[PDB]
């Protein structure tokens, strides 16, 4: 009975306005123990972490983004929206040992660290695949590495994370019997393996780093997995 996290499907603003987006938990009030995070998806499937820990803004994010709790929901406020803020915003809530993403809000505005993932994998139905995510420009073992699935009109789905320092894993209920997460420390690379693939697995798979109590700041560009004969 995984929690369901709900966001507004779509909101419209205009440049210079202030707008707030919310994130609701099916279990009850969102609290600071849910460590709410907000992530932005810009066109070309480019993800950036904006806020974590309810209200901690990630370095380099414009100051017009802020997080809070309002009405027993997590809330992202954009103060003075800019045209380039037109994007899909996803929240994520922590439930003791897993993250759950909301469905995302499409915001219309009317008017160096790298995670390196291969662009694509074309595989046959029934086959296996091993996806890779190479960390560069930071200390691989100091951040958890998360993996996230995106299918169109299906929002983000948390798969799980690995602690590269220890190899320890945590998975979502949906992926606890599907994904196998490993790391190779000398090459600073995280891996995710699947077998018995089907068209239900066709999606973009992202890796994203996370530091305890902080935020999903940096994301890979995603590997498009296409399961097709």
- Asked whether residue 222 is assigned to any structural domain, the reply reads no
**CATH code, domain carrying 157:** 2.60.40.10
Same domain, 170 and 211: yes
Same domain, 83 and 123: no
Same domain, 36 and 132: no
Q: What is the DSSP letter of 12?
A: E
First-to-last alpha carbon distance for the chain, in angstroms, is 35
What are the two backbone dihedrals, phi and then psi, of residue 83, each rounded to the nearest 5 degrees? -60, -35
d(CA 46, CA 220): 8
Same domain, 144 and 179: yes
Q: How many CB atoms lie within 10 A of CB 114?
A: 13
Q: What is the DSSP letter of 58?
A: P
d(CA 97, CA 149): 18
Which residues, listed in sequence order, are joined to residue 171 by a DSSP beta bridge?
A: 160
Last residue of a domain, one of 89, 109, 129: 109
Q: What angle do CA 96, 97, 102 make, to 5 degrees?
A: 85
d(CA 86, CA 10): 11
What are the two backbone dihedrals, phi and then psi, of residue 18, each rounded to the nearest 5 degrees? -105, 135
Same domain, 43 and 120: no
Same domain, 147 and 195: yes
Last residue of a domain, one of 81, 109, 137: 109
Same domain, 88 and 64: yes
- Asked whether residue 226 is assigned to any structural domain, the reply reads no
Distances (CA, A) of 31 to 89, 94, 158: 20, 10, 20
SS3 state of residue 73: strand
d(CA 102, CA 156): 8
Same domain, 123 and 101: no
Q: How many residues does the chain have?
A: 229
Query: Per the structure, how many domains does the chain have?
Result: 2
Tell me the longest C-alpha to C-alpha distance in the chain: 51
- Side-chain half-sphere exposure of 67, counting CA atoms within 13 A: 27
Q: Give Rg (Cα) of the chain.
A: 17
Where would I find the beta strands (DSSP E) of 124-186? Answer: 129-136, 144-150, 156-162, 169-171, 180-184
* Residue 105: closest CA among 28, 61, 50, 60: 50
Range of the domain at 72: 5-109
Structure determined via: X-ray
**Each residue of 12-21: b (16+ CB within 10 Å) or e?**
ebeeeeebbb
Same domain, 48 and 76: yes
- Asked whether residue 195 is assigned to any structural domain, the reply reads yes
d(CA 202, CA 165): 30
Last residue of a domain, one of 64, 93, 109: 109
How, if at all, do strands 114-116 and 203-210 pair?
unpaired
Resolution to 1 decimal place, in Å: 1.5
Q: How many CB atoms lie within 10 A of CB 31?
A: 14
- Asked whether residue 228 is assigned to any structural domain, the reply reads no
Same domain, 165 and 69: no
Q: Where are the alpha helices (DSSP H) in 77-223?
A: none
Same domain, 120 and 213: yes
* Residue 205: closest CA among 153, 167, 151: 151
d(CA 27, CA 39): 22
d(CA 71, CA 182): 40
Chain gaps in the chain, named by the residue before each (C–N > 2.5 Å): 111
d(CA 65, CA 81): 9
* Residue 74: closest CA among 49, 50, 93: 93
């Amino acid at each position: 009975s995984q929690a369901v996290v709900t966001q507004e499907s779509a909101l419209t603003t205009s440049p210079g306005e202030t707008v707030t987006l919310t994130c609701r938990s099916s279990t009850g009030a969102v609290t600071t123990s849910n460590y709410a995070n907000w992530v932005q998806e810009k066109p070309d499937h480019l993800f950036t972490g904006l806020i974590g820990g309810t209200n901690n803004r990630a370095p380099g994010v414009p100051a017009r983004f802020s997080g809070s709790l309002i009405g027993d929901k997590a809330a992202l406020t954009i103060t003075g929206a800019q045209t380039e803020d037109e994007a899909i915003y996803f929240c994520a809530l922590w439930y003791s040992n897993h993250w759950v993403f909301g469905g995302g809000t499409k915001l219309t505005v009317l008017g160096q660290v790298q995670l390196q993932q291969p662009g694509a994998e074309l595989v046959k139905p029934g086959a296996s695949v091993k996806l890779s995510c190479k960390a560069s420009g930071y200390t691989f073992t100091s951040y958890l590495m998360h993996w996230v699935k995106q299918r169109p009109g299906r929002g983000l789905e948390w798969i799980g994370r690995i602690d590269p320092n220890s190899g320890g894993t945590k998975y979502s209920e949906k992926f606890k019997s599907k994904a196998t997460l490993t790391v190779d420390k000398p090459s600073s690379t995280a891996y995710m393996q699947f077998s018995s693939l089907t068209s239900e697995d066709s999606a973009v798979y992202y890796c994203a780093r996370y530091y305890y109590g902080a935020y999903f700041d940096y994301w890979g560009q995603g590997t498009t997995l296409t399961v097709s004969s």
